[PDB]
């Protein structure tokens, strides 16, 4: 089984620094040559850098020399991406990869992939609201609820709902950046409006970046 | 720097049939031109390299095709595995560079969306701002229009939506609008409206609710 371990990253503030690691086992890693990708919010992937099995080949794109330095330890079958100078732009999700070098600089294999934001703003846990259930609820129909997640800073939260014993028909949707610079999302899910009035409903909030965590209750309102 | 162009963004598809996703450059890269797939949350597999070679593993219905600026994916009867979204690579030159991919979604029957209308919470307006959400669940196709009217008025620029990934097993899209406003407009308006359009629909539906009740 081959597999790339990354770690690293997070949130760091412009014209900061920060060391990204890619361990790699289930390969002879210094037989090989390896590569940093990253893509962006919204964006296609971008080729950030390469280096050979004994370090005397780096190349960058030309874009990126400035700010990136990518290094490997061949003992600690480990490379690098160190990140200086950084800028908001550089907000994006880094992968390492090793290269297919019996024939070319395709990737064969892919890390997990680390996330880094770069900002000026402190972390910031969310507040969570309910989106209580329709009063008009169809009568022996389908009511939906929900909790709103909101003004979180860096990305990601998870939500769950019973304590993960709640699955079915839930939809958690990708967070959005709202102009403030801070996240939202909601979790909704749709259940039998029989249901209203025996059983309860609560969404589990975690926002570990600031160790927020939210059990909210989501009831018919009076 | 050579450009990978991927002319759809979005094809749709059946279980079993062929789908073939192009790729083009914007100058020859002879044939050195590898295709990747990936999944929501998943990083990318290696599938094409040397444009129309295997990697090892890769199923024998994945093939590739083209040389010099030109350049295909085919997928032979497509399994429901494959739902994903491809995309091509370049290896001729540096810097490399990557095409920014195509998704593909499964058809099925047109579903119209349920339609949900959220007021802030009492908890919300203490803080000075009112959200206000409306929900369309379990639809498709993915193309929807949610306006939102406050006392009948078309707004504009204070909303933002979200929308789900197909889900594996109904294969319908949901999606979420918010509306934000301070808590001092919020008190000063009485309709809050979320309207929808949608293929589904012969017309549009509207959830609303009156503040306060």
């Known amino acids: 089984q081959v597999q790339l371990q990354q770690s690293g990253g997070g949130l760091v503030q412009p014209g900061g620094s920060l060391k990204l690691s890619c361990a790699a086992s289930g390969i002879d890693f210094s037989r090989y040559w390896m590569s940093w990708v990253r893509r962006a919010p919204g964006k296609g992937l971008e080729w950030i850098g390469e280096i050979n099995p004994d370090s005397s080949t780096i190349n960058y794109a030309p874009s990126l020399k400035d700010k990136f330095i990518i290094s490997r330890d061949n003992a600690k079958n480990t490379l690098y991406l160190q990140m200086s100078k950084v800028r908001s732009e550089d907000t994006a999700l880094y992968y390492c990869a090793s290269l297919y070098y019996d024939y070319g600089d395709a990737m064969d294999y892919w890390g997990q992939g680390t996330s880094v934001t770069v900002s000026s703003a402190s972390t910031k846990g969310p507040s969570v609201f309910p989106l209580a259930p329709s009063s008009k609820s169809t009568s022996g129909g389908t009511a939906a609820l929900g909790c709103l997640v909101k003004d979180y800073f860096p990305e990601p939260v998870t939500v769950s709902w019973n304590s993960g014993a709640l699955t079915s028909g839930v939809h958690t949707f990708p967070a959005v950046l709202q102009s403030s610079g801070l996240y939202s999302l909601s979790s909704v899910v749709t259940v039998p409006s029989s249901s209203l009035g025996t059983q309860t409903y609560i969404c589990n909030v975690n926002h570990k970046p600031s160790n927020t965590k939210v059990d909210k209750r989501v009831e018919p309102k009076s | 720097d050579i450009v990978m162009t991927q002319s759809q963004r979005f094809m749709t598809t059946s279980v079993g049939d062929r789908v073939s996703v192009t790729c083009k450059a914007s100058?020859?890269?002879?044939?050195?031109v590898a295709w990747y797939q990936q999944k929501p949350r998943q990083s990318p597999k290696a599938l094409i390299f040397?444009?129309?070679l295997r990697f090892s593993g890769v199923p024998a219905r994945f093939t590739g095709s083209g040389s010099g600026t030109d350049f295909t994916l085919t997928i032979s009867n497509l399994q429901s595995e494959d739902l994903a979204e491809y995309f091509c690579q370049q290896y001729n030159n540096y810097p490399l560079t990557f095409g920014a991919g195509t998704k593909l979604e499964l058809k099925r029957t047109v579903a119209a969306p349920s339609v949900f209308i959220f007021p802030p919470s009492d908890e919300q307006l203490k803080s000075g701002t009112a959200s206000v959400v409306c929900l369309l669940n379990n639809f498709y196709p993915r193309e929807a229009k949610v306006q939102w009217k406050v006392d009948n008025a078309l707004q504009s620029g204070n909303s933002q939506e979200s929308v789900t990934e197909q889900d594996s097993k109904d294969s319908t899209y949901s999606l979420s609008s918010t509306l934000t406003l301070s808590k001092a407009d919020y008190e000063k308006h009485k309709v809050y409206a979320c309207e929808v359009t949608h293929q589904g629909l012969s017309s549009p539906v509207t959830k609303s609710f009156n503040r306060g009740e």
């Open positions: 100058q020859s890269v002879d044939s050195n």
């Open positions: 040397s444009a129309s």
